[PDB]
């Protein structure tokens, strides 16, 4: 109807005005803010572990893994380079978010996770039924003006699309993927013959009635991992249990479809899950029946949760509401002034409102304390850090 | 001697609220037989639609406005979408932007901004309803394809107009274009050539998604004819009377002439020809003001022209040697403004003249 | 000093049947 | 009488115009009939009245009043969506080189056709000699215009003084003038006149006018190379050519524009315009090959950018005819010349973009980064005189837009009606570029050079104070 | 007067926009106001992050764990992602609540609330009723078991003023915010409602704030530049990926973080950040066709046509001569020869490119005469002339 | 001088916002009775039986019904509540532009 189009136009005008106000108030909220508009939107973003610190310069160089989402052109696996101002300074140093490599990819990349033991091997989720394990060291920097070249490893055990992808941190190899055919497969890789083409799935896990939307390995135990599906259930799988159908735990954990999942880097029990119910929940593995605090400040679906790599009680979530929030677990449940209560719950620490479309992915930098890079659907990438005043 | 045989009497008189001069009036000739007579009026920042009934009853149907800018409409044109039979109205002026309005939906369908200055005229091809010709103040004229939103050709350049183009008109069958301008010239651009036909076909057969390169518009620099020895000043309006030409300037006459010699065919005329023969002149008075277009009905039987005081001359063209006689002049004691334009219905029964005092006058044939 | 800032701003956007009378609908125009 | 003839002519014209009007009316009737028949199809939907829209309660209203009785009607106005506009600019035409602006009876049938008489070489090549400009290798060029002051546009000038020829042995074939006894001696005696043998009668061969003109032109070109003439001309064996030749024998501020000097038998010293106007005596002028005023070429290894090169020192592009080591001459058809003082001549310009400027109107934005002191583009336009420049400026002062650019003491470049894309450059007190007039191949051309390093997408400015026209008067 | 109406409209447009934003941002904020440096007066709470997260479960367990009428039951389920609204099932984590509806004139009653408390106390329910107190019987069922004054002055054209006084000190009239410090209030007014200019001037009695419209206020579209010129019905489609020219911005690098000061009220970019247009048709340029095809060539078609016409307009010339001059001019203009040494190759190219046209026109004699004339004009050579002649003869023999 | 910025709001959106604001003000008395930061809701009480009375507020689907006695119903004639204290799920119906998912679309993840 014409009413829907008119409301959409009015909302677009309001969005533009709100963005102008936010940009006007930018220097009073952050310590660094850099925005770069990509040629094509990227559905993935993950910092690489390596950092290069030149001598005599007041900046450092960090790396990134990005994808491409083109309507009809060739799709690539772009690895970018970002220069952060360290502590001193910059105003004009020419290129600051310049790319480094492009590798031809067949279809848009939904995930671009890197292998933790050897960051050279990169695994990606293709729109087809095959998961490709790339090696950007071997491939040339400049893409070949032809079709998709050899990926050097083509792992195929699925039957449809997918969005979940995990690598074992404790053991070399052992990739896990959660797809839309209601199954999750385990690939041993590593111990495979050279010049290999197709690698069969070692184990097939089928205990979810609906599409599995995420999967993650346990950060401390090398034989246990948990998966979440959109049928409102959070299962805790155990490897080498001689049972590929019944998981150890089957907590429902939410009302609507659950999207994401993340384990606490320090605690061996604490984890958080997100869902379309506009709610993030914390748990402890010792007592799975009782649910800990539940954060409720979003207005739409939550698509990602990421624990801080350097802080015990910091966690961030993002979603279709075009906003990203920072939560502090040590601040939950304490008295607040009426003005603070009007502003928001005490746990909420920050609301980032610099994006105009839905947040697609984000990550924290391992090598820098409190910097986050987020990519939205309007071909915009942002690297930002909140003010030191907020967290003292 | 005789004041023709058609008698017109005033039956109604309106007055627009904006109190600003109105510049255009157009009768919808595409309506079927028996349908109500709908005409459109443009002026200032608003465009209004009226409908004519029996006994001089005119009812306002719709009204629009452009409050976002300082638009000042000058002209209008009626078309139709052959896919769905919905009539369309195109307006322009001042800002050099063309808006195609859908009266049924009451929304602006398309917009075209590629001109360099104000637009003074819009016309539609007699055979193809998707081709619009706009004459602008940047010494150029453009042919658009409103179906695919592509620019077909540009009609200015090395040998084009040296000043503002004020008017233009198609032939009866839509094969040649004659342009008038403020540089005293009257150039005859021909759209019957194989180059123009191929350009039109390529415009109709273009898809923006399949190609990366843009459209290649034709740039016509040399007209097929040009004459400066007919009028001593700027030509306000031009019109095709079959194979002859009717043109008007500040000389208080509308001279009927043909290109070439007395017996030279229009089709077989070389671009280097420099002969013009005049045949007759229609004489009026008190019309030294410029931008006052005359009009003729569909069957080319009669022509009418306004006046800077408020008179209205109607000449009969069926009489032998029409240059003679004094025609019929229509006046009313309450009319004292400048008649900017007039219009005839598809059947020559109702004639409406738009004055500069934001008033609309209706004259009916007693028959 | 006549009227208040909120009253004047409430006499600027609504100028129709829902003018809420009070001093907003008073002689704010023409001083 | 005369009055009766005039009356008859007037009556005939009256009947002619009446018949023309009748024919036009018949054509109008037929065309309107077919148009109506075409319109007889289709349906076309009628329009309806507009009511109050619930999407805007505080909408405005429009009321019309009927003077002759009738009530008053009120309706709500719809609002039209906003549209983005562009700055006002007038039509122009593209240009890449300057364009000079200035404001059969001879009885020479084509020799290729059957109808062609016999003419001398001075008349069979008059058109070719007159309508050729050697400075640009084009027939009736647009840049250089002749005022008909010269005698037949200097046919062949006087450079064809290489009349020395040497006879060689090994004839081309069995048929030749050398083979016939006495023909060579007779030809030598005939050509020895400056300012008896060969008693064989000439062969009965028909010589048409076209063939005679062909043979005369070939003789004038090749001197006495009879075998080559016979080879070039269709048929016309060597014996026939020799017979025809025998038959034809006996029986019957401080800068001034450069203008070539063609003084004969006089050294180039204080007599020709090249010496008088203080400019180097170039190659195109007809002075002696060892003229003192001729500018020697540069012997640089490459680059030719620094001040060490005399060509750059004198503000002049490296001429291909003189500069051979610097690399300008090499790769004439190709690109990537080692010499940097050839940019204007080669026509290598940067990629520019058009967008509305942040100062006024339109502006030019550079596509890619440019280093310092690098060629960007050339200011092309129409060449007009000074008085024409003032008249055009007075005409254009009505709407305050001047594109004039001073070039020399008598020439102006006007990029108003026709020009290049570099004309959309705005004045600034902190320019990013500057202009230098460089004598390229005897023609003064304007080149726009980058003053400092320029980033990607940067808007282009250059100072307009150097031009003759007042920059502040226009902007 | 019309001046007053113009002033009212000019001050009513931004006021209406900001009133709408004030209503909207109290439910869906863009950022918190307790995280602003100049508004850090709120959130007067410190950091106590010195406790482990492994005791949360134990603390939670200790603190908390340790005529005719039809009767139909209405069950409302939680809205999943697929469902637009909450499903409702009329029975004559899955279930959110239960309700009872009577249809005869309608009445809806609920038994369980959101918290599933013991609701529906016994008694009459004065709930809303829609047709299709009262004397007739009612359908009611209950489920149970049994200082610092601040002045404003709105300036128009520096001549028209509107004396006004603020009712609430340190309160923004537009957003109804509470900036309890005057400096914070002024900074918030400047930064949030930037469509006005707030020139605090101070008064002998109190403090006066002068408000005027902002002349420039660059508030254009901040998204894709191509969307500002698309046709209606396709602008701001937001349906799929769109290519754009890369650009980089740096909004904040390292703020100095200065302290409060009353003396105040007494960026970097790289790349293409504009929409470009064509020089010929003056139409917008898409990025897909911007890098290449610079649309500038040596010989424009208008120049070619003008040259042809001017050559053919001569009076003293033969047909073949005019044809050969036109051909030579076109070839030279197309190929851009500039060198006398290049003329030798130009002749060979001319005879090797236009040979078919010359043969068809039958102007070999005219072409050879032109070659002789050009040789007499210096340049070229007899070797070039006869080589071209033999090449033309060989081409003629090959054709025939 | 410089080219016009061409503000994105235009006048059609301004007219829509003005109409919506007039309707909201007339419906909720935000500007007059709400002190500019509160919404005023009116209840409806007719008859109550003692074994408690249920009241429905005039703005529909904003505040849930409650059970109160006769004295509470009498003392609860009008209710004022801050927009911060409104229920988050039910406050979005007060205006279609309070929050709307602009790219509703489909597919995606
Ligand atoms: Zn020349
Ligand atoms: Zn000389
Ligand atoms: Zn000399
Ligand atoms: Zn000399
Ligand atoms: Zn040199
Ligand atoms: Zn040199
Ligand atoms: Zn050189």
- Determine, for residues D67 and B359 on separate chains, whether the beta-carbon distance falls below 8 Å: yes
- Which residues does chain E have within 8 Å of residue D347's beta carbon, measured at their own beta carbons? 298, 336
- From ligand 4's centre to the CA of D270, what distance in Å? 10
Domain spans, chain F = 12-91
- From ligand 5's centre to the CA of E38, what distance in Å? 65
Residue with tokens 């704030």: E209
C-alpha distance from residue E240 to each of A163, A377, B214 (Å): 19, 9, 22
D75 closest CB neighbour out of B16, B56, B60: B60
- Determine, for residues C18 and F36 on separate chains, whether the beta-carbon distance falls below 8 Å: no
How many Å lie between the alpha carbon of C22 and the closest alpha carbon of chain E?
Answer: 15
d(CA A231, CA A227): 12
Which among E65, E91, E92 is positioned nearest to E76, based on CA atoms? Answer: E91
How many Å lie between the alpha carbon of F1 and the closest alpha carbon of chain A?
Answer: 24
- Determine, for residues C30 and E1 on separate chains, whether the beta-carbon distance falls below 8 Å: yes
- From ligand 2's centre to the CA of D154, what distance in Å? 15
How many Å lie between the alpha carbon of D70 and the closest alpha carbon of chain C?
Answer: 30
Q: Is A220 helix (H, G, I), strand (E, B) or coil?
A: coil
Q: What's the CATH number where A140 sits?
A: 2.130.10.10
Q: Are D260 and D287 in contact (CB under 8 A)?
A: no
- Determine, for residues A21 and E249 on separate chains, whether the beta-carbon distance falls below 8 Å: no
Which among A254, A363, A345 is positioned nearest to A306, based on CA atoms? Answer: A363
C-alpha distance from residue F65 to each of D388, E67, E115, F30, F61 (Å): 89, 27, 13, 21, 10
Sequence-separated (6 or more) residues with CB below 8 Å from residue A310: A369, A370
C-alpha distance from residue B240 to each of B77, B170, B179, D39, E86 (Å): 18, 7, 11, 20, 68
- Determine, for residues D355 and E275 on separate chains, whether the beta-carbon distance falls below 8 Å: yes
How many Å lie between the alpha carbon of E172 and the closest alpha carbon of chain C?
Answer: 9
Q: What's the CATH number where B126 sits?
A: 2.130.10.10
**Selected residue of D9, D16, D34, D45 to mutate for chain B interface (largest B Cβ count, 10 A):** D45
How many Å lie between the alpha carbon of C12 and the closest alpha carbon of chain D?
Answer: 13
- From ligand 6's centre to the CA of D317, what distance in Å? 7
d(CA D192, CA A64): 91
Domain spans, chain D = 183-248, 344-474
d(CA D403, CA D361): 14
- Which residues lie across from E71 on neighbouring strands? E102
What is the H or E stretch that residue A384 is in?
Answer: strand A380-386
Nearest CA in chain E to A38: E246
d(CA A271, CA A307): 9
Sequence-separated (6 or more) residues with CB below 8 Å from residue E269: E247, E248, E249, E250
How many Å lie between the alpha carbon of D79 and the closest alpha carbon of chain E?
Answer: 14
d(CA E95, CA E93): 6
- Domain interval for residue B164: 8-365
Ligand 6 (ion): residues with CB under 5 Å are: D 298, 311, 318, 323
How many Å lie between the alpha carbon of F52 and the closest alpha carbon of chain A?
Answer: 32
Chains sharing 3 or more CB pairs under 8 A with chain F: A, B, C, D, E
Q: Is D56 on the interface with B (CB under 8 A)?
A: no
- Chain F segment 33-62 residues within 8 A of C by beta carbon are 36
Residue B247 lies in a domain: yes
What ligand is nearest to the CA atom of residue D316? 6
Residue E325 C-alpha from the chain's centroid: 56
d(CA E88, CA E91): 10
Residue B2 lies in a domain: no
For E238-306, the DSSP string reads -SS------EEEEEES--------GGGG--EEEE--S--B-TTT--B--GGGTSS-----SS-HHHHHH
Q: With b meaning 16 or more CB within 10 Å and e meaning fewer, what string describes E169-205?
A: ebbbbbbbbbbeebebbbbbbbebbbbbebebeeeee
Nearest CA in chain A to E31: A351
Residue with tokens 């040339």: A140
d(CA D84, CA B300): 41
- Which residues does chain E have within 8 Å of residue C12's beta carbon, measured at their own beta carbons? 8, 11-12, 15-16
β-pairing verdict for A79-84 and B328-330:
unpaired
Can you read off the two tokens belonging to residue E322?
């005019």
D358 closest CB neighbour out of F2, F4, F16: F2
Can you read off the two tokens belonging to residue E214?
């902002």
How many Å lie between the alpha carbon of E190 and the closest alpha carbon of chain F?
Answer: 20
- Which residues lie across from B206 on neighbouring strands? none
- Determine, for residues F36 and C14 on separate chains, whether the beta-carbon distance falls below 8 Å: no
Kindly state the DSSP code that residue E72 receives in the 8-state scheme. E
β-pairing verdict for B150-154 and B218-219:
parallel
- Domain interval for residue A218: 8-392
d(CA D303, CA D322): 16
C-alpha distance from residue C11 to each of A59, A224, B50, D168 (Å): 55, 66, 37, 112
Q: Are D165 and D223 in contact (CB under 8 A)?
A: yes
Axis crossing angle, helix F12-28 with helix E2-24, rounded to the nearest 10: 70
- Which residues does chain A have within 8 Å of residue E24's beta carbon, measured at their own beta carbons? 14
Residue B185 lies in a domain: yes
Torsion of CA B161, B165, B171, B175, to 10 degrees: 40
Angle formed at CA F13 by CA F9 and CA F17, multiple of 5 degrees: 115
- Determine, for residues D67 and B322 on separate chains, whether the beta-carbon distance falls below 8 Å: no
Kindly state the DSSP code that residue E62 receives in the 8-state scheme. I
Nearest CA in chain B to E281: B114
Chains C and B are touching, with contact defined as 3 or more CB–CB pairs separated by less than 8 Å = no
For B129-156, the DSSP string reads TTEEEEEESSS-EEEEETTTTEEEEE--
- Determine, for residues B213 and E289 on separate chains, whether the beta-carbon distance falls below 8 Å: yes
Q: Are E95 and E75 in contact (CB under 8 A)?
A: yes
Q: How many CA atoms lie within 13 A of E307 on its CB side?
A: 25
Q: Is D24 on the interface with B (CB under 8 A)?
A: yes
Which among A165, A176, A190 is positioned nearest to A112, based on CA atoms? Answer: A165
Phi and psi at E268, nearest 5°, equal: -65, 135
d(CA F12, CA F22): 16
Q: Are A298 and A275 in contact (CB under 8 A)?
A: no
- Which residues does chain E have within 8 Å of residue F97's beta carbon, measured at their own beta carbons? 20, 24
C-alpha distance from residue E271 to each of A38, A94, D365, D422, E278 (Å): 11, 10, 11, 21, 19
- Which residues does chain C have within 8 Å of residue F14's beta carbon, measured at their own beta carbons? none
d(CA E242, CA A72): 10
Burial class (CB in 10 A: 0-12, 13-18, 19+), E130: exposed
Angle formed at CA D164 by CA D163 and CA D168, multiple of 5 degrees: 130
Ligand 7 (ion): residues with CB under 5 Å are: D 304, 318, 323, 326, 328, 339, 341
How many residues make up chain B in this entry? 367
d(CA E340, CA E378): 9
Q: Which value in Å is the resolution of this experimental model? A: 3.1
Q: With b meaning 16 or more CB within 10 Å and e meaning fewer, what string describes A155-186?
A: bbbbeebbbbbbbbeeebbbbbbbbbbbbbbb
Angle formed at CA A304 by CA A302 and CA A310, multiple of 5 degrees: 130
d(CA A250, CA A238): 12
Chains C and A are touching, with contact defined as 3 or more CB–CB pairs separated by less than 8 Å = no
Kindly state the DSSP code that residue E42 receives in the 8-state scheme. S
Nearest CA in chain B to F13: B68
Sequence-separated (6 or more) residues with CB below 8 Å from residue D6: none
Residue B353 lies in a domain: yes
Q: Is F27 on the interface with C (CB under 8 A)?
A: no
Which among B71, B65, B70, B62 is positioned nearest to B28, based on CA atoms? Answer: B62
Burial class (CB in 10 A: 0-12, 13-18, 19+), B290: middle
Q: Is E286 on the interface with B (CB under 8 A)?
A: yes
- From ligand 4's centre to the CA of D327, what distance in Å? 26
How many Å lie between the alpha carbon of E374 and the closest alpha carbon of chain F?
Answer: 56
- Determine, for residues C14 and F21 on separate chains, whether the beta-carbon distance falls below 8 Å: yes
d(CA D198, CA F57): 136
- Which residues does chain B have within 8 Å of residue F10's beta carbon, measured at their own beta carbons? 68
Torsion of CA D262, D264, D269, D274, to 10 degrees: 0
Q: Is D162 on the interface with E (CB under 8 A)?
A: no
d(CA B71, CA B23): 13
Residue A3 lies in a domain: no
- Which residues does chain B have within 8 Å of residue D31's beta carbon, measured at their own beta carbons? 172-173, 242
- Which residues does chain E have within 8 Å of residue C6's beta carbon, measured at their own beta carbons? 167, 173
End-to-end CA distance of chain A: 51
Q: How many CA atoms lie within 13 A of A46 on its CB side?
A: 21
- From ligand 7's centre to the CA of D336, what distance in Å? 13
Domain D344-474, what fold?
Answer: Beta-clip-like (2.170.270)
Sheet with A212-217, strands from edge to edge, namely: A212-217, A224-229, A233-238, A249-251
Domain count along chain B: 1
d(CA A141, CA A144): 9
Strand blocks (E) in B128-275: 131-136, 141-145, 150-154, 165-170, 176-181, 186-190, 218-219, 226-227, 235-241, 244-249, 253-259
What ligand is nearest to the CA atom of residue D140? 1
d(CA E264, CA E269): 27
**Selected residue of C1, C3, C4, C5 to mutate for chain E interface (largest E Cβ count, 10 A):** C5
């Amino acid at each position: 109807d014409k009413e829907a189009a008119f409301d959409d136009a009015v909302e677009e005008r309001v969005i533009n005005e709100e963005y102008k106000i936010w940009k006007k108030n930018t220097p009073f909220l952050y310590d660094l803010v850099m925005t770069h508009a990509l040629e094509w939107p990227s559905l993935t973003a993950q910092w690489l572990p390596d950092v290069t610190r030149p001598e005599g310069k007041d900046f450092s160089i960090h790396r990134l893994v990005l994808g491409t989402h083109t309507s009809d052109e060739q799709n690539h696996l772009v690895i970018a380079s970002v220069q952060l101002p360290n502590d001193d300074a910059f105003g004009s140093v020419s290129g600051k978010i310049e790319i480094e490599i492009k590798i031809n990819h067949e279809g848009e990349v939904n995930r671009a996770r890197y292998m933790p033991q050897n960051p050279c091997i990169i695994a990606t989720k293709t729109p087809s039924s095959d998961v490709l394990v790339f090696d950007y060291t071997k491939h040339p920097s400049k893409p070949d003006p032809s079709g998709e070249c050899n990926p050097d490893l083509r792992l195929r055990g699925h039957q449809k699309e997918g969005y979940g992808l995990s690598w074992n941190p404790n053991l070399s190899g052992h990739l896990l993927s959660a797809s839309d055919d209601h199954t999750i497969c385990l690939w041993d890789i590593s111990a495979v013959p050279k010049e290999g083409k197709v690698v069969d799935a070692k184990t097939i896990f089928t205990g979810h009635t609906a599409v599995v939307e995420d999967v993650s390995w346990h950060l401390l135990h090398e034989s246990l991992f948990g998966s979440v599906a959109d049928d409102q259930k959070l299962m805790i799988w155990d490897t080498r249990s001689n049972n590929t159908s019944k998981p150890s735990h089957s907590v429902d954990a939410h009302t609507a479809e659950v999207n994401c999942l993340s384990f606490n880097p320090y605690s061996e029990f604490i984890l958080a899950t997100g869902s379309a119910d506009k709610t993030v929940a914390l748990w402890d593995l010792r007592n799975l029946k009782l649910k800990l605090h539940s954060f409720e400040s979003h207005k739409d679906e939550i698509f990602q949760v990421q624990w801080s790599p350097h802080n015990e009680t910091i966690l961030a979530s993002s979603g279709t509401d075009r906003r990203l929030n920072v939560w502090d677990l040590s601040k939950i449940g304490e008295e607040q002034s009426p003005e603070d209560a009007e502003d928001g719950p005490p746990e909420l620490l920050f609301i980032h409102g610099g994006h105009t479309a839905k947040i697609s992915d984000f990550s924290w930098n391992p090598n820098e304390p409190w910097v986050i890079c987020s990519v939205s659907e309007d071909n915009i990438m942002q690297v930002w850090q909140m003010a030191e005043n907020i967290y003292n | 001697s005789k004041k023709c045989k058609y008698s017109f009497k005033c039956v109604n008189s309106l007055k627009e609220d904006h109190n600003q001069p109105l510049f255009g009036v157009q009768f919808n000739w595409h309506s079927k037989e028996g349908d109500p007579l709908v005409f459109a009026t443009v002026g200032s920042n608003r465009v209004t639609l009226y409908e004519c009934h029996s006994q001089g009853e005119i009812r306002l149907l719709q009204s629009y406005v452009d409050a976002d800018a300082d638009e000042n409409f000058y002209t209008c044109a009626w078309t139709y979408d052959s896919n769905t039979s919905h009539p369309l109205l195109a307006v322009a002026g001042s800002r050099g932007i063309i808006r195609i309005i859908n009266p049924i939906t009451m929304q602006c369908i398309k917009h075209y901004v590629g001109h360099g200055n104000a637009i003074n005229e819009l016309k539609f091809h007699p055979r193809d309803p998707n081709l619009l010709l706009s004459v602008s103040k940047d010494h150029a004229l453009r042919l658009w394809n409103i179906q695919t939103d592509t620019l077909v050709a540009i009609f200015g350049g090395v040998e084009g107009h040296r000043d503002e183009v004020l008017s233009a008109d198609y032939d009866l069958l839509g094969e040649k274009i004659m342009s008038c301008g403020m540089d005293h010239s009257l150039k005859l651009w021909r759209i019957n050539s194989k180059r123009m036909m191929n350009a039109i076909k390529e415009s109709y057969d273009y898809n923006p998604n399949k190609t990366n390169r843009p459209f290649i518009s034709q740039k016509i620099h040399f007209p097929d004819f040009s004459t400066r020895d007919i009028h001593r000043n700027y030509v306000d309006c031009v019109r095709w009377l079959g194979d002859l030409i009717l043109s008007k300037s500040c000389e208080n006459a509308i001279v009927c002439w043909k290109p070439g010699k007395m017996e030279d065919d229009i089709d077989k005329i070389k671009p280097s020809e420099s002969n013009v023969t005049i045949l007759g002149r229609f004489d009026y008075s008190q019309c030294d003001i410029w931008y006052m277009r005359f009009s003729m009905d569909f069957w080319q039987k009669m022509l009418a022209l306004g006046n800077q005081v408020g008179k209205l001359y109607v000449w009969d063209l069926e009489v032998e040697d029409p240059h003679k006689a004094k025609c019929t002049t229509l006046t009313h004691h309450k009319c004292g403004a400048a008649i900017r334009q007039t219009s005839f219905s598809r059947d020559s029964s109702i004639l409406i003249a738009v004055c500069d005092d934001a008033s609309i006058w209706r004259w009916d044939r007693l028959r | 000093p006549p009227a208040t800032q909120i009253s004047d701003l409430s006499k600027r956007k609504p100028k129709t049947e829902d003018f809420l009378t009070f001093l907003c609908l008073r002689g704010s125009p023409a001083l | 009488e005369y009055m009766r003839l005039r009356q008859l002519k007037r009556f005939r014209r009256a009947d002619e115009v009446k018949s023309m009007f009748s024919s036009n009316r018949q054509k109008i009737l037929e065309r309107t009939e077919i148009l109506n028949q075409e319109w007889k199809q289709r349906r076309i939907q009628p329009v309806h009245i507009l009511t109050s829209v619930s999407s805007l309660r505080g909408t405005r209203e429009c009321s019309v009043t009927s003077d002759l009785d009738f009530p008053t009607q009120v309706i709500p106005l719809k609002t039209l969506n906003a549209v983005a506009s562009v700055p006002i600019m007038y039509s122009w035409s593209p240009l890449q080189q300057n364009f000079m602006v200035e404001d059969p009876p001879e009885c020479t049938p084509n020799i290729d056709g059957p109808n062609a008489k016999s003419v001398q070489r001075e008349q069979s090549l008059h058109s070719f000699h007159t309508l050729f400009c050697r400075r640009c290798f084009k027939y009736d060029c647009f840049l250089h215009r002749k005022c008909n002051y010269s005698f037949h546009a200097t046919p062949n000038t006087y450079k064809r003084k290489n009349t020395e020829t040497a006879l060689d042995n090994k004839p081309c074939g069995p048929q030749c003038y050398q083979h016939l006894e006495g023909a060579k001696e007779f030809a030598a005696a005939l050509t020895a006149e400056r300012i008896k043998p060969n008693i064989e009668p000439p062969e009965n061969v028909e010589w048409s006018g076209a063939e005679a003109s062909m043979f005369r032109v070939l003789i004038g070109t090749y001197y006495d190379n009879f075998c080559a003439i016979a080879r070039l001309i269709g048929t016309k064996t060597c014996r026939q050519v020799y017979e025809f030749r025998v038959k034809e024998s006996s029986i019957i501020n401080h800068v001034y524009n450069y203008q070539p000097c063609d003084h004969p038998r006089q050294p180039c010293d204080s007599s020709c315009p090249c010496v008088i106007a203080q400019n180097f005596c170039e190659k195109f002028c007809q002075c002696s090959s060892e003229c003192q005023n001729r500018f020697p070429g540069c012997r640089c290894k490459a680059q030719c950018n620094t001040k060490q090169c005399p060509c750059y020192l004198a503000v002049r592009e490296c001429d291909p005819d003189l500069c051979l080591t610097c690399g300008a001459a090499d790769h004439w058809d190709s690109k990537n010349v080692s010499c940097k003082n050839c940019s204007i001549q080669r026509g290598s310009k940067k990629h520019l973009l058009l967008a509305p400027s942040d100062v006024a109107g339109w502006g030019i934005f550079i596509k890619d980064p440019v280093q310092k002191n690098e060629f960007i583009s050339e200011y092309c336009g129409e060449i007009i005189s000074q008085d024409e420049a003032d008249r055009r400026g007075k005409v254009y002062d009505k709407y305050m837009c001047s594109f004039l650019f001073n070039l020399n003491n008598d020439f102006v470049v006007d990029a108003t009606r026709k020009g290049n894309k570099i004309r959309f450059a705005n004045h600034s007190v902190n320019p990013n570029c500057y202009a230098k007039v460089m004598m390229v191949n005897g023609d003064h051309r304007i080149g726009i050079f980058a003053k400092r390093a320029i980033q990607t997408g940067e808007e282009l400015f250059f100072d307009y104070r150097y031009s003759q026209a007042d920059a502040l008067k226009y902007v | 007067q019309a001046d007053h109406e113009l002033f009212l409209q000019a001050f009513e447009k931004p006021t209406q926009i900001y009133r709408f934003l004030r209503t909207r941002n109290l439910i869906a904020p863009i950022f918190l106001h307790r995280t602003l440096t100049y508004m850090s007066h709120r959130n007067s709470r410190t950091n106590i992050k010195r406790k482990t997260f492994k005791v949360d479960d134990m603390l939670s367990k200790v603190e908390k764990m340790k005529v005719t009428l039809e009767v139909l039951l209405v069950k409302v389920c939680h809205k999943k992602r697929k469902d637009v609204s909450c499903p409702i099932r009329q029975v004559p984590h899955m279930v959110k609540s239960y309700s009872l509806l009577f249809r005869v004139f309608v009445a809806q009653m609920t038994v369980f609330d959101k918290n599933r408390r013991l609701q529906l106390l016994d008694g009459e329910y004065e709930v809303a009723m829609q047709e299709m107190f009262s004397q007739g019987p009612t359908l009611q069922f209950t489920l149970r078991w049994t200082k610092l004054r601040i002045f404003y002055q709105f300036l128009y054209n520096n001549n028209t003023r509107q004396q006004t006084e603020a009712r609430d000190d340190l309160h923004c009239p537009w957003c109804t915010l509470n900036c309890r410090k005057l400096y914070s209030l002024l900074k918030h007014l400047k930064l949030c409602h930037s469509r006005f200019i707030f020139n605090y001037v101070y008064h002998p009695k109190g403090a006066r704030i002068d408000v005027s419209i902002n002349e420039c206020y660059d508030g254009s579209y901040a998204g894709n530049p191509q969307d500002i010129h698309r046709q209606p019905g396709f602008a701001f489609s937001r349906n799929g990926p769109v290519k754009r020219t890369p650009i980089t911005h740096i909004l904040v690098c390292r703020p100095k973080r200065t302290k409060a000061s009353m003396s105040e009220f007494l960026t970097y970019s790289s790349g293409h950040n504009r929409l470009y247009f064509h020089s010929d048709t003056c139409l917008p340029l898409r990025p897909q066709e911007m890098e290449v095809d610079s649309e500038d060539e040596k010989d424009p078609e208008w120049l070619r046509e003008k040259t042809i016409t001017q050559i053919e307009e001569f009076s003293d010339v033969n047909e073949g001569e005019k044809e050969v001059m036109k051909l030579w001019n076109l070839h030279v203009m197309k190929h851009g020869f500039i060198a006398d040494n290049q003329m030798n190759h130009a002749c060979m190219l001319f005879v090797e490119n236009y040979g078919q046209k010359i043969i068809k026109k039958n102007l070999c004699r005219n072409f050879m005469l032109h070659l002789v004339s050009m040789h007499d004009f210096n340049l070229i050579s007899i070797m070039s002339i006869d080589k071209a002649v033999t090449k033309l003869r060989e081409m003629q023999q090959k054709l025939e | 001088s410089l080219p016009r910025p061409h503000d994105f709001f235009d006048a059609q959106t301004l007219d829509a916002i003005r109409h919506r604001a007039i309707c909201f003000n007339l419906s909720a008395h935000i500007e007059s009775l709400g002190k500019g930061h509160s919404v005023v809701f009116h209840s409806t009480v007719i008859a109550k039986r003692k074994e408690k009375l249920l009241l429905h507020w005039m703005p529909e689907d904003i505040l849930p019904d409650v059970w109160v006695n006769e004295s509470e119903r009498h003392q609860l004639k009008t209710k004022v509540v801050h927009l911060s204290k409104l229920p988050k799920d039910t406050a979005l119906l007060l205006d279609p532009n309070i929050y709307r998912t602009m790219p509703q679309k489909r597919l995606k993840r």
